Design a protein around this ligand. Structure first.
Ligand code: CA
Ligand code: CA
Ligand code: CA
Ligand code: CA
Ligand code: CA
Ligand code: CA
Ligand code: CA
Length: 318
């Protein structure tokens, strides 16, 4: 295996200086990544893989072969969130965060809407299949449950499916932060599910801090999405580009906020809303600590700006 390198995007979102506070290894926190599957035994991933599930064709299955990445995309996205900080490969934004790999996309990267809807439900129910096992009314941020705190969706399309949208509303109202790619058509507004008001739409910058021209406009925040090196099957590494690559940077920063807030207070922040500019919710903190590029304030290119984990966490803890 090759010696560890830090991909430029990990440095760009200011993640490494947070790790001494937390690398996301606060046991209550998990990130669900709804994608093509994962290379579950990849040496730079395996120890962070808490659950590997499939919802393809209606069936929930944890058979390894059912849950394994047959495309490469999911393994790449997951390594950007949580590739381990060790002597090999790469390193994620939250290199100690627990991952749920929820395969909702086939070998080609296509998914049906009820498969993705079911994926969202699985992220809430978690490996034990029960939402609120101890009946205390708390799901996200409850160490007695195994619900994810972040659902990351590096996928999207022009289609708005109400069944999937209902699942999103359920997760959001459970206190789960939802993050998704704005899309790759240079379009005037984000694909769904990014375009849902409950969801953080993520646009893609390059290494010069320019918005990538394929990045769909009107995102909520933006993140590294060009020349992104991460993990790839089989026990390998590969470089990809797209708002799918920017998304996991934002999910990692969210995992760091919630892990650091929990470590200090014994609880997590509310998700918040698009318009939030206070330090009282996850999204408010993302918006006000982002590097504001382009026109001052929120803009159609960068949204609120480039996410910055070191400032986000400082805002969350102060
Ligand atoms: Ca949890
Ligand atoms: Ca492997
Ligand atoms: Ca590594
Ligand atoms: Ca559960
Ligand atoms: Ca509970
Ligand atoms: Ca509890
Ligand atoms: Ca701006």
């Amino acid at each position: 295996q090759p010696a560890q390198t830090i991909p430029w995007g990990i440095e760009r979102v200011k993640a490494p200086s947070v790790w001494s506070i937390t690398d996301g290894s606060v046991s209550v926190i998990q990130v669900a990544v709804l994608d093509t599957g994962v290379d579950y035994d990849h040496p730079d991933l395996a120890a962070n893989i808490a659950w590997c599930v499939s919802t393809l064709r209606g069936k929930v299955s944890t058979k390894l072969r059912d849950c394994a990445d047959q495309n490469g995309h999911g393994t790449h996205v997951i390594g950007t969130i949580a590739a381990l900080n060790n002597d090999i490969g790469v390193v994620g934004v939250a290199p100690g965060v627990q991952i749920y790999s929820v395969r909702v996309l086939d070998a080609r990267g296509s998914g049906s809407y009820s498969d993705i809807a079911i994926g969202i439900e699985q992220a809430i129910l978690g490996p034990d299949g029960v939402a609120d096992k101890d009946g205390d009314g708390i799901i996200a941020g409850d160490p007695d449950d195994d619900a994810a705190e972040v659902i990351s969706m590096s996928l999207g399309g022009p289609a708005d499916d109400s069944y999937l949208y209902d699942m999103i509303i359920q997760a959001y109202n459970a206190g789960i932060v939802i993050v998704a790619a704005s899309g790759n058509e240079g379009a005037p507004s984000p694909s769904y599910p990014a375009a849902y008001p409950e969801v953080i739409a993520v646009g893609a910058i390059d290494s010069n801090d320019n918005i990538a021209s394929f990045s769909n406009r009107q995102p909520e925040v933006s993140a590294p999405g060009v020349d992104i090196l991460s993990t790839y099957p089989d026990d390998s590494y590969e470089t990809l580009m797209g708002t799918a690559m920017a998304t996991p940077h934002v999910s990692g920063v969210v995992a760091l906020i919630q892990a650091a807030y929990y470590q200090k207070y014994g609880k997590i922040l509310p998700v918040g809303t698009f318009d939030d500019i206070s330090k009282n919710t996850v999204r408010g903190i993302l918006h006000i600590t982002a590097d504001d590029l382009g026109p001052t304030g929120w803009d159609a290119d960068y949204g609120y700006g480039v996410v910055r984990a070191a400032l986000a966490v400082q805002a969350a803890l102060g």
